[PDB]
């Protein structure tokens, strides 16, 4: 296809801090990956972010009941949808699965959710910060995550190495030893 | 702490539109325009919550009426194609004769059109494959997950072939062993 | 619990 493509995008975003105690609502309209008009609950009205959206910002802000409706969106939309899915979104907990191999020894924790994780090493009684390389957090796209911590620190005479993983779904640290 | 995003788009002249809900980077559900059904990313979600899909179809109608207006507002200037980063991944430890799933991750591309194919030993492999909708990004490009289950072996190579108008030739990432 | 779509607004012409 020689044909040129034209893309419209709109995103209604709900930002939550300390649960539903502090909510911010954003109504965002995009054209060719370039926002042009936006409503912000902190601002309280539609505003053009580019000149391309100024006819919308003035037209929409003048509509009967528009402002009232958008000012109420933090309660009727964001807080509403937050509580509808709270059981399996904010409260989802899947514990990790750890395995340690060498290739340099690697500890890999998979199938965990949410994303916040802390994994540490111990060579052996004390954690050794040197020689650690972290893969970063990997999003599996199926509501699980991955991570490998590759460790360049050759163990020697019966050295017991333990990858310690700390996830919000468990009450005490998860420890496995090599 | 948490962000819920209702993300919609419409693409001309392919007449392609999409409606999904994002939670902290993971999709809660999308609406299948063709079947007019709500599609939960996890089947478990559908037993605890609901969504009337036809309200998503009404939005797609509006977005498209808007798009024509927005392209006319813009003197019919097209989108600049952007080629995708792709990455083939494994899911858990790889072990001989122990079933895993291959993951092909397509990132930072626009427009949201893509031909992706799984190649086993240079031959196309079509059965067992799963696929996600395009997922929104903060830079407003798109992401896509393709999954291929398999039993690992030594006499089997695997590739993920990606076609995107941003690329001059098809992009391909390899996985062996 | 049912989810709510925020409706898309028609642009100015």
């Amino acid at each position, epitope marked *: 296809d020689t044909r040129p493509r034209f893309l419209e995008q709109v995103k209604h975003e709900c930002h939550f801090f300390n649960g539903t105690e502090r909510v911010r609502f954003l109504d965002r309209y995009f054209y060719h990956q370039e926002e042009y008009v936006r409503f912000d609950s902190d601002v309280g009205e539609y505003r053009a972010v580019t000149e391309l959206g100024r006819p919308d910002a003035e037209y929409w802000n003048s509509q009967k009941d528009l402002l009232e409706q958008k000012r109420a969106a933090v309660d009727t939309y964001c807080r509403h949808n937050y509580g509808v899915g709270e059981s399996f979104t904010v409260q989802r907990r899947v514990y990790p699965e750890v395995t340690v191999y060498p290739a340099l020894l690697v500890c890999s924790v998979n199938g965990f959710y949410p994303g916040s994780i802390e994994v540490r090493w111990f060579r052996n009684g004390q954690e050794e910060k040197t020689g650690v390389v972290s893969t970063g957090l990997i999003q599996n796209g199926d509501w699980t995550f991955q991570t490998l911590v590759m460790l360049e620190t050759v163990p020697r005479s019966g050295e017991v190495y333990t990858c310690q993983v700390e996830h919000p779904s468990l009450t005490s640290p998860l420890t496995v030893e090599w | 702490e948490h962000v819920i995003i209702q993300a919609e788009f419409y693409l001309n002249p392919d007449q392609s539109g999409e409606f999904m809900f994002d939670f902290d980077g993971d999709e809660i559900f999308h609406v299948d325009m063709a079947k007019k059904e709500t599609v939960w990313r996890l089947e478990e979600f559908g037993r605890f919550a*609901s969504f009337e899909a036809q309200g998503a179809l009404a939005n797609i109608a509006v977005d498209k009426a808007n798009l024509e207006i927005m392209t006319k507002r813009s003197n019919y200037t097209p989108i600049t194609n952007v080629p995708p980063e792709v990455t083939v991944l494994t899911n858990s430890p790889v072990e001989l004769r122990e079933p895993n799933v291959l993951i092909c991750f397509i990132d930072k591309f626009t427009p949201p059109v893509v031909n992706v194919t799984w190649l086993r030993n240079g031959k196309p492999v079509t059965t067992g494959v799963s696929e996600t909708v395009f997922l929104p990004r903060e830079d407003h490009l798109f992401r896509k997950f393709h999954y291929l289950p398999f039993l690992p072996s030594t006499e089997d190579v695997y590739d993920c072939r990606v076609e995107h108008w941003g690329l001059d030739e098809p992009l391909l990432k390899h996985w062996e062993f | 619990g049912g989810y709510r779509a925020r*409706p898309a607004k*028609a642009a100015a012409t």
Partner: T-cell receptor
Framework: DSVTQTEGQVTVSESKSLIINCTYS????????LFWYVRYPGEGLQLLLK?????QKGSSRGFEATYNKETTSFHLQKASVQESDSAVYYC????????????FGQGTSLSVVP | AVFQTPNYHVTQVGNEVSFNCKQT?????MYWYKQDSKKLLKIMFS???????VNETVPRRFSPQSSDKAHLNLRIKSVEPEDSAVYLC?????????????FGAGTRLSVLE
């Protein structure tokens, strides 16, 4: 999805207090929105008041209505009706999760007698 | 405001009638409601941005039409005595159910044998 309210006409002397009963029994919708619409003689239908969150109270023109989460009701009350309150009052619900689509009660015609 | 037209109409069974409505609120969504002889108020149609989004199983007789966001027209191809009613046009900011509906004065249709 049904709304039932006071059927027929109610006659009330001015300065007396008024209750218009309204209960909703909609098997198939979670979190409804509740409305009171009013039609003054020779006029068109217009909103009296609405409540869009489960526990709150809406007020207008001296009228009051509480969205009850236990009695599944939206009773309309006024402490001292005035003669200009003579009208037809409509109780209505809508599904907050779907398209706006009002299910109306049968309507109560109020005649405030001086 | 919500203007509808005509105010009164009388016609024999089998004829065609057309009702027209207009709202000046800048709203996206318009409606047809039917007010039958017995003080009842049931929704017939709902249009959003010229697209039909709600149809409460109305007989094929009725054909709403909207070439513009602000206009909603109703046409009844060949009327039956059951069609005698008051038809109310309304408008709402969008199709969200929290939105207030604003109603017109109504069209009073009387269909006679």
């Amino acid at each position: 999805d049904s709304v039932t309210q006071t059927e027929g006409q109610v006659t009330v002397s001015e300065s007396k207090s008024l209750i218009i009963n309204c209960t909703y029994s909609a098997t198939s919708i979670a979190y409804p929105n509740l409305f009171w619409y009013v039609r003054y003689p020779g006029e068109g239908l217009q909103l009296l008041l609405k409540v869009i969150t489960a526990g709150q109270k809406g007020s207008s023109r001296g009228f009051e209505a509480t969205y009850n989460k236990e009695t599944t009701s939206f009773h309309l009350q006024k402490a001292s009706v005035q003669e200009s309150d003579s009208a037809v009052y409509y109780c209505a619900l809508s599904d907050s999760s779907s398209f706006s689509k009002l299910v109306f009660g049968q309507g109560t015609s109020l005649s405030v007698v001086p | 405001a919500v203007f509808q037209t005509p105010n009164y109409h009388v016609t024999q069974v089998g004829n065609e009638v057309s009702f027209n409505c207009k709202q000046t609120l800048g709203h996206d969504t318009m409606y047809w409601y039917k007010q039958d002889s017995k003080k009842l108020l049931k929704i017939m149609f709902s249009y959003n941005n010229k697209q039909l989004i709600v149809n409460e199983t109305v007989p094929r007789r009725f054909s709403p039409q909207s070439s513009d966001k602000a206009h909603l027209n109703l046409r009844i191809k060949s009327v039956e005595p059951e069609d005698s009613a008051v038809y109310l046009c309304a408008s709402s900011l969008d199709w969200a159910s929290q939105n207030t509906l604003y109603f017109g004065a109504g069209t009073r249709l009387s269909v006679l044998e």
